[PDB]
Amino acid sequence: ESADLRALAKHLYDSYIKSFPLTKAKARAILTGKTTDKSPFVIYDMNSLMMGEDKIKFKEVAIRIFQGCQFRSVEAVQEITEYAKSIPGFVNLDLNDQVTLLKYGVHEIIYTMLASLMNKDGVLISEGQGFMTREFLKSLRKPFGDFMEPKFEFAVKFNALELDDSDLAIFIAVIILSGDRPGLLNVKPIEDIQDNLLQALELQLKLNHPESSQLFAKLLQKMTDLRQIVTEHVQLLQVIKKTETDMSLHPLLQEIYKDL
Ligand SMILES: CCCCCCCCC(=O)O
């Protein structure tokens, strides 16, 4: 029945709120400087990174920015893992499959959600107290300058669909439960859940965005851009592991990469 899927759409939206402090809705309130529900300090040059630590809670600059972005990713994983637990069925799967689903799944969700924190011109840093311009990032030293850039590229395409937090909650739940993923001992239970989630996503898209012709199809197509961006990410990473074999990396970010 439609009613059953509607109930699942709501259950996941509830957990999404509970698990992600910076909603897309909060983000686009901060970004659209109209509603000064607290406006961000912005960082656009080296000499403004200073008052970023002056006014905001947060070893060469380009490295220290990169480490700070890497730290927001472990926090992003922690939250994503918290959200998965709530997807009905998930905790019931084989444990080894729970991990692989997360191993491949988190990154794709990192950048889906990061799109909420972006406009064409920059990205919210530091829970929303900051805003760092895409140009300052692009201007960084050359093993880091073009690191974040293809994220802005994806975000601008993706932001165009203009999704809700209530749509994203079902969409990120789909991404997690792929079955497409290498090493899954047990695929059909994963696939059975995802087909029910794609039902929830489909329906929700039609109710929440009716005049938006074939958004469901257009959304699922954006998973093409997602995969491709995670891949040039890991190759960008392994390069920094040899340009600065003195720079560390969080262990929980280590496990996301058994490459090849
Ligand atoms: C540290 C709070 C996490 C939110 C975005 C992280 C960006 C922080 C930074 O790059 O300095």
Numbering used by the authors: 207 to 264, 275 to 476
Report text from the authors:
Overall, the structure of the PPARγ LBD is described as a three-layer helical sandwich fold composed of 12 α-helices containing a dynamic or flexible internal ligand-binding pocket. The PPARγ ligand-binding pocket is among the largest in the nuclear receptor superfamily, ranging from 1200 to 1400 Å3 in crystal structures with three branches described as ‘T’ or ‘Y’ shaped. Branch I is located proximal to helix 12, which forms a critical part of the activation function-2 (AF-2) coregulator binding surface; branch II is located near the β-sheet surface, close to the predicted ligand entry/exit site where helix 3 meets helix 6 and the helix 11/12 loop; and branch III is also located near the β-sheet surface but deeper in the pocket near helix 5.
Similar to our edaglitazone crystal structure, we observed electron density consistent with a bound bacterial MCFA in both structures, which we modeled as C9. Compared to wild-type PPARγ or GW9662-bound PPARγ, we found that C9 binding was more potent for SR16832-bound PPARγ despite the bulkier addition in SR16832, relative to GW9662, that points towards and blocks the branch II C9 binding mode. However, SR16832 preincubation lowered the assay window of activity to a large degree; smaller MCFAs (C9 and C10) only showed a small increase in TRAP220 peptide interaction, whereas C12 and the endogenous UFAs, AA and OA, did not.
